[PDB]
Design a binder for this molecule. Structure first.
Ligand code: ZN
Ligand code: ZN
Ligand code: ZN
Lengths: 133, 586, 49
């Protein structure tokens, strides 16, 4: 799979049509489109099965380059859950003058900047997907 | 939140909300600023305002302490405490405060919105902290007054040096000078992008820029100002008489290139901060340049109040100082880019106050001290920290842009902190060998203002003629039209076309605006032209008002020419004072 | 009454001054933490290549 590819929305629908063609309930590959919490659970159950196919590198925070004071930043403007599908932030500022406290806290808590500013990590002690050092 | 006071430098948490700068005030100081002014809003970690829902009072003496919040009389709880008590507003450090009997100066600085010269007089005749607060208040009100001007919405782009520009109705016309450069930022499809900084001046506005650009639809230029940060560093540390020449490294080899400046350098090496009173062109541009070569052992830092005035500094600096070892830091408007960027550790540093990082040096030279204000001096001293400060010039130059000044122009000795000691206690140093201007101009300025300290260079050719015209005064927008002067221009140019090889000097470009219909030459302002001049000069005063063309305007504007200058003395001030030639129409 | 209402007002003023000191210290801590976080973000962005 393409390393940059994270959506897989079409692939999830193709998997559902291939293995659950006559499952008579609407399946939302992205749980943002679900009707209620019961539908969220229903579609997340299928997303659990369908995410075992897609690469583990395509999940986690969905990051893009934004500019603050004209200086580029790498922040997570979305997330690709193995269960909730692709979720995109709604209040995403690709450009900004300055961040006072709230956006500063969000970007500090954001693993995007730390992972992008860290060294690639291959930790063979654990089978868990390492991100960065 | 918490900081030192302006009158006492004592820690306090009270800030005047009705002050444009909101300085920190001691409890006694806050009380004094509250009782004697209409400043009824005082700020703290929380604003001193009635927090009761449905109330809008914003006083302080009417505000009472109720519970954990603030209330007025109409909403205070039964347990209430007056904010104004014991001659001090309730705030942090209510027991550790000294106050000051000098409270009228602070009130005059704050209450008066910089309308007359007395505000500047009292701002300059006080302590450092009060002067800095006055300077930042003046900058804030200058920004407010500048934002109340017209907005240039470009409807069409016609050609170069001229635009099909229109604006709104009612909004006034920007002034003539370059002090109102436009730095607006337009939007094209999604957000703001880079535009650039240019100094639009009146010659449908001529731009004095060396680069080219094509405007688009919806692009507008605004008088963009900056946020005035608080000023910490003083203008200058007090002087002290040194016993020996210290602070600068004495080298065993001395420079014999400027024999008449060795004594000046020796005297500078004895004083902490010094300033030499010399007319424009009296080694003003190269005094620091020759100092950097006489003693190549001091960190020489050059700075100017204008970004467009650095070309005169760099014209001969590259010939005198080395080019390889000198460099200019390029921030991330037209200057050299062949230098090496990010040269933090360098003996010679060229930069501007807008983007000057923290650094240290030994000798700092500030050319063009007339147009720099106390805020500019504080910025210069805060960006660059050194034990010596050198000021080149004199108060008898073109004054600073006192745009909000409505009454009579400020006296030269009140322009800056340097001008205060330059004219009251006496000039620390003076130049007695001024071999730059001939006998006419040097003798005139010596007999006029310069304490007969200048001597004749060479003989006066007495080739200058003055005609006796009268003219009529009529204002249309900001200038006047004089057909008799149009007549005398031709009556002077009739003799030879070789007279024209000159630079047209005029504070107001109305003559160029009138002539543009037939000639159309690009317009440039004389604000930043020192150090570069031609032999012949074309001078048309066209004015007689003391508001701008006052007594201290022409005595240094006639010093630019070498031997040829128009000396049309249409004003009845020095006509019957000198001996030139004059004739009537045959 | 002068030793019960005035003494209560003095205690209330001391409590208010203490709360103001705590709020000022909180704002100073906010400024320090803001500067630290901003510098951390700016010094980790420069290593992004
Ligand atoms: Zn005030
Ligand atoms: Zn005080
Ligand atoms: Zn109230």
């Amino acid at each position: 799979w393409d390393l940059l590819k994270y959506d897989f929305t079409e692939e999830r629908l193709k998997l559902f049509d291939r293995y659950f063609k006559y499952w008579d309930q609407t399946y939302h590959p992205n749980c943002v489109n679900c009707l209620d919490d019961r539908c969220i659970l229903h579609c997340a159950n299928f997303n659990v099965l369908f995410s075992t196919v897609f690469p583990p590198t395509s999940f986690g925070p969905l990051v893009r380059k934004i500019f603050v004071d004209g200086v580029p930043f790498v922040v997570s403007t979305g997330y690709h859950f193995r269960e909730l599908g692709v979720v995109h932030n709604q209040d995403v500022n690709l450009h900004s003058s300055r961040l006072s406290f709230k956006e500063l806290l969000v970007y500090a808590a954001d693993p995007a900047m730390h992972a992008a500013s860290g060294n690639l990590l291959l930790d063979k002690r654990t089978t868990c997907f390492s991100v960065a050092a | 939140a918490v900081g030192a006071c302006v009158l006492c430098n004592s820690q306090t948490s009270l800030r005047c909300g009705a002050c444009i700068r909101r300085p920190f005030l001691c409890c006694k100081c806050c009380y004094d600023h509250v009782i004697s002014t209409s400043h009824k809003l005082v700020l703290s970690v929380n604003p001193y305002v009635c927090n009761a829902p449905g109330c809008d009072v914003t006083d302080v003496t009417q505000l009472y302490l109720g519970g954990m919040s603030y209330y007025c009389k109409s909403h205070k709880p039964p347990i209430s405490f007056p904010l104004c008590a014991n001659g001090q507003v309730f705030g942090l450090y209510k027991n550790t405060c000294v106050g000051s009997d000098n409270v009228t100066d602070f009130n005059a600085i704050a209450t008066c919105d910089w309308t007359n010269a007395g505000d500047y007089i009292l701002a300059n005749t006080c302590t450092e902290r009060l002067k800095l607060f006055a300077a930042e208040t003046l900058k804030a009100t200058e920004e407010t007054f500048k934002l109340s001007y017209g907005i240039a919405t470009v409807r069409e782009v016609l050609s170069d040096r001229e635009l099909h520009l229109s604006w709104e109705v009612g909004k006034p016309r920007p002034p003539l000078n370059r002090n109102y450069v436009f730095t607006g930022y337009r939007v094209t499809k999604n957000s703001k992008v880079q535009i650039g900084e240019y100094t639009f001046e009146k010659g449908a506005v001529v731009y004095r820029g060396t680069t080219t650009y094509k405007l688009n639809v919806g692009d507008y230029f605004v008088l963009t100002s900056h946020t005035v940060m608080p000023l910490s560093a003083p203008t200058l540390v007090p002087q002290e008489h040194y016993v020996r020449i210290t602070g600068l490294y004495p080298t065993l080899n001395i420079s014999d290139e400027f024999s008449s400046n060795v004594a000046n350098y020796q005297k500078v090496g004895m004083q902490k901060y010094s300033t030499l009173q010399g007319p424009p062109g009296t080694g003003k541009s190269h005094f620091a340049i020759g100092l950097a070569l006489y003693y190549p052992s001091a960190r020489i830092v050059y700075t100017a109040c204008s970004h467009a005035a650095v070309d005169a500094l760099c014209e001969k600096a590259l010939k005198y100082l080395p080019i390889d070892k000198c460099s200019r830091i390029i921030p991330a408007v037209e200057c050299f880019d062949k230098f090496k960027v990010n040269s933090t550790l360098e003996q010679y540093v060229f930069c501007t106050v807008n983007a000057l990082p923290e650094t240290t040096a030994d000798i700092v030279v500030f050319d063009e001290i007339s147009m720099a204000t106390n805020y500019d001096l504080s910025v210069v001293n805060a960006r660059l920290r050194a034990k010596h400060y050198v000021y080149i010039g004199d108060p008898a130059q073109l004054p600073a842009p006192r745009t909000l000044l409505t009454k009579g122009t400020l006296e030269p000795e009140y322009f800056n902190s340097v001008c205060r000691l330059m004219k009251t206690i006496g000039p620390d140093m003076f130049l007695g060998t001024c071999r730059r201007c001939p006998a006419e101009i040097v003798d005139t300025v010596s007999a006029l203002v310069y304490d007969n300290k200048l001597k004749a260079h060479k003989d006066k050719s007495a080739q200058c003629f003055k005609m006796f015209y009268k003219g009529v005064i009529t204002h249309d927008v900001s200038s006047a039209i004089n057909r008799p002067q149009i007549g005398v221009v031709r009556e002077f140019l009739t003799r030879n076309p070789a007279w024209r090889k000159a630079v047209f000097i005029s504070p107001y470009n109305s003559q160029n605006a009138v002539a543009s219909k037939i000639l159309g030459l690009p317009t440039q302002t004389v604000d930043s032209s020192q150090g570069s001049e031609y032999d012949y000069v074309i001078f048309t005063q066209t004015t007689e008002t003391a508001h701008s063309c006052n007594v201290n305007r022409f005595n240094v504007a006639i010093t630019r020419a070498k031997v040829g200058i128009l000396c049309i003395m249409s004003d009845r001030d020095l006509y019957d004072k000198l001996q030139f030639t004059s004739l009537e129409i045959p | 009454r002068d030793a019960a209402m005035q003494r209560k007002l003095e205690k209330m003023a001391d409590q208010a001054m203490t709360q103001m000191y705590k709020q000022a210290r909180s704002e100073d801590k906010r400024a320090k933490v803001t500067s630290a976080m901003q510098t951390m973000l700016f010094t980790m962005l420069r290593k992004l290549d």
